[PDB]
Amino acid sequence: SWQEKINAALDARRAADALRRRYPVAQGAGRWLVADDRQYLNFSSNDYLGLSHHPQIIRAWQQGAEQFGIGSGGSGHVSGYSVVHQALEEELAEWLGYSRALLFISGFAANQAVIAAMMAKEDRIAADRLSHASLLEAASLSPSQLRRFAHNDVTHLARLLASPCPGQQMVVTEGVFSMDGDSAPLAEIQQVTQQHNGWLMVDDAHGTGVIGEQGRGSCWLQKVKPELLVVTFGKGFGVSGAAVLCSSTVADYLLQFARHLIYSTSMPPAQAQALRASLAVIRSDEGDARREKLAALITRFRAGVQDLPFTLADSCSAIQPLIVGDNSRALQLAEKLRQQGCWVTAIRPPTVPAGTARLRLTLTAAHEMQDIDRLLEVLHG
Amino acid sequence: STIEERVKKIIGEQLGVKQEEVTNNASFVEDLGADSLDTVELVMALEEEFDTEIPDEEAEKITTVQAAIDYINGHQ
Ligand SMILES: *P(=O)(O)OCC(C)(C)[C@@H](O)C(=O)NCCC(=O)NCCC(=O)NCCc1ccc(S(*)(O)O)cc1
Ligand SMILES: Cc1ncc(COP(=O)(O)O)c(C=O)c1O
Question: Domain Aminotransferase class I/classII large, which positions (chain A) (predicted)?
Answer without folding.
Answer: 39-379
